[PDB]
Every structure is written in C-alpha cells, then in structure tokens.
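---------- Forwarded message ----------

FYI, see the inositol-pentakisphosphate 2-KINASE record below. Original note from H. follows.
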Amino acid sequence: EMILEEKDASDWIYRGEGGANLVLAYAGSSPLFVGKVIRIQKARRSVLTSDEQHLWRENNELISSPNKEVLEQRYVQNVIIPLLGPKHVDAGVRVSVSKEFLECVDKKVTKQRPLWRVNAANVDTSHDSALILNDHSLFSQGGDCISVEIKPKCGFLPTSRFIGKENMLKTSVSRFKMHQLLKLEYIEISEESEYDPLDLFSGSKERVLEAIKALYSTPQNNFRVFLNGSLILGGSGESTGRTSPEIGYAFEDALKGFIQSEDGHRTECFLQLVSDAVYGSGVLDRLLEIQKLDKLDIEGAIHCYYDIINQPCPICREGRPLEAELSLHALPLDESLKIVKEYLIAATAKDCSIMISFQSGDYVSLKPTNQTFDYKVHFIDLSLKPLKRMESYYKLDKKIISFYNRKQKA
Ligand SMILES: Nc1ncnc2c1ncn2[C@@H]1O[C@H](COP(=O)(O)OP(=O)(O)NP(=O)(O)O)[C@@H](O)[C@H]1O
Ligand SMILES: O=P(O)(O)O[C@H]1[C@H](OP(=O)(O)O)[C@@H](OP(=O)(O)O)[C@@H](O)[C@@H](O)[C@@H]1OP(=O)(O)O
Ligand SMILES: [Zn+2]
C-alpha cells in the first residue's frame, strides 16, 4: 500500500523507454524504493476487446484483469513464465499513482527524452497504477556493477509453405537485416547495423562473439551498457548512431577498475566477457523456442486472424483466386485461435530484452585479464501485443520485403 503524489516525482529520474512504457530509476532516499525502477504505460497520439477475450479465454484470470497493468502482470506470470521459466523473469509489484504524479513525472523527464518520442507518445495519465520492478543495472540489494542490455530481435528464418514466390528472399535473409534498409530510408537510423541476430542465437561460440562485437560497433536500439545504473553505451530511450572513435575512448576509460587490462584493450576484453556470459548461460536458447511459436509467418497467420474475427479475408479475395490459402481457412476455430495466440506470444519474445549484470553459480573466467565475474540474467520488456495489431503486422511485413526486393533490382 502506497500512493505516489506530485511531490514524489522529484525522486525519479529518466532511465529509458520504448514505444509502450516509460521507465524511471529511483533517485531519492526512501528505503522502500531504493534499487527499483518504475514502468509507466504510455498513451499514443475497456481492458480487452471482444476478440481479445475470445482469444485469451483459456486464461480466465487474464480476461478478468481490472486494468491494463494487472493484465501485463498476469500475462507474464500465467503465459510467459510457463514458457520461459521463472528463474530470469520478474512480473513486478503494482503501486498506486495519482493523475498529478504521472503528469509531474511526464514533465520532469521531457527534456531528457528523444524529440520524436515526445511527438508520438506521452504517459497515460488515466491509469491509477504503475509497475515496480527490480533495477537490474544494480547487481542486487559488492563494489561496482557493469550492466548490459541486449534487444536480440528475431533469430530464426521463416521456412514457410505460405511465403509467395515473389517474397522468397524472406527464407534466406533475416527480418532484422531487411528492416534496416527500410529504417534507413525513413531516417530512423544513421547507418545499417552490422549485427545479424542469426549469429547470436546460433549456439556457436565464435558466432556469438561476432554478434557481440557488431552490437558494440553499431549499438542502435539493440545494445546498451550501464555503470551502476548510468548509461555508458547505447541510446537514451531510442536508437543510437555508430560507435565513433570518441565514444570508444570514453567507454574504454569507463571500464577502468572493473576490467583489469592495459589501456586500449579493456573493450575487446569486455566484449569477450559479454559473449562468454551469453554463450555460457544459453539463456537465448529458450527464448528462440518461444519466437518459433510463429510457425507459419505473418503471411500464413494473417489468414487465421480474419477467421478469428469472423471477417471475410481481404488477402484471399483481393488477390488471385487460384492462389487463395484454402489450406488455412479449412482449419477449425480452435486451431485458428491457437496459431494467432502463439503468434502473439512469439511477438512478445521477438521484442523483449535481456539484461546481464556483472560483478567482480553463474560465473565467467576471463583468461586475458585473470579475473572472475559473477553474473545474473533477467528478461525485461515482456509486453502483451494487441490482437488488432495483426493487420499492421502484415502491412509492415509487406512494406519491408517489397522494399528489400526492389532494392535488389539495383
Ligand atoms: N527492471 C529494469 N531494470 C533496469 N532497466 C530497465 C528495467 N526495465 C526497463 N528498463 C529500461 O527501460 C527501457 C524501456 O523498458 P521497456 O520495458 O523495454 O519499455 P517498452 O516501451 O515496453 N519497450 P518496447 O515495447 O519494445 O518498445 C529498457 O530499454 C531498459 O533499458
Ligand atoms: O515491429 P518491429 O519488429 O520493428 O518492433 C517494434 C515493436 O513492435 P512489435 O514488437 O509489436 O512488432 C515496438 O513495440 P511497441 O512498443 O510498439 O509494443 C517497439 O519496440 C519498436 O521500437 C520496435 O521496432 P524495432 O526498432 O525493434 O525494429
Ligand atoms: Zn485468407
């Protein structure tokens, strides 16, 4: 029991954000909130639609959620944990908030937010609740703690019965790689990321290290590093441009004390440590199993979505009739519901992040520095994706592939 009022907004500072939630770390002195983060949902510019209630009917505690914050809490603990495991997942504790606290918080951090983020979304000041999670950038509560955030994205390729001849490049080239080309076009990134999510998930030592190095070279919105809660690499609530020579010098120096290596080598040693931690723990393996719940791709699943909402299928009837996916539409409701539900769970896994906390059971021995590091892994950002979003998923996919295709015509 706790109600945060307008005065409490002074005790929270900006940490980061995505497209759904704004996150703030504690900067006050209250013993009850020290070492915690606050996850506040944003409104873009009642709790579940009828069709969402039909889709999540097997989970009754889910469909009876009073607000959207409890819904997220019950989605993680009733759907995602039975799939990922409870060891590295925190569902978090609820806390009551006021309309004013939320408004003051919104205003407090505005200046530290990205310009375009301020444009698209602000905090939803109509919610009476917020999520309190453990601040993973702190090791627990030892000395210093270097923390690494990774947004791995999708690490498998569609193998589909349902991807057309004209989109067959989707079988060979990753979604992440293809998206980079579109992102660059809409000036959402400065340069094409060198990171290939197929390497990180490959379960191969040399390929994981290759992936970690690429995440250093072009962090964008996929790689962040924190010294004791303080951002020392990556973007602040957005994607960031290439690690320049200068960013490199600062990060190399920020590593002093923690990594015991001679100047100009602490970085290559640190990237060895992150690689060893990721590879050794195999925490990615079980997440790939959840991403693979998208078995038919959006070009397959889309047909099932129109069967679920009882709407005539546009894709089938507005295309060539002899190429209509009769296969999928012949499927019973229960089957149709299963595919789309598993697709939405996969989307959660495709969009989550991983935070590895390091400190001088789970441990790494760095031969080049002669040091030992304890580490903890936690999954974060395990949101429930709206069912309505299947339609925008198909449009986005159709936009990415066709733009990739016509670029290959050069
Ligand atoms: N428990 C935590 N400990 C430390 N940092 C956190 C924690 N939770 C969130 N963050 C930071 O806050 C940022 C945004 O949190 P996140 O849960 O990804 O918001 P989101 O808007 O739901 N993301 P997305 O839906 O992918 O756009 C992350 O990139 C983290 O750096
Ligand atoms: O659609 P994509 O795969 O690009 O993923 C986007 C994701 O939507 P999805 O996870 O529901 O698809 C968004 O999540 P919401 O906050 O809107 O819930 C947000 O995280 C974007 O930054 C992601 O773009 P990215 O920068 O990672 O490419
Ligand atoms: Zn169809």
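H. also flagged this: The CA atoms of residues 182 and 316 lie 26 Å apart.
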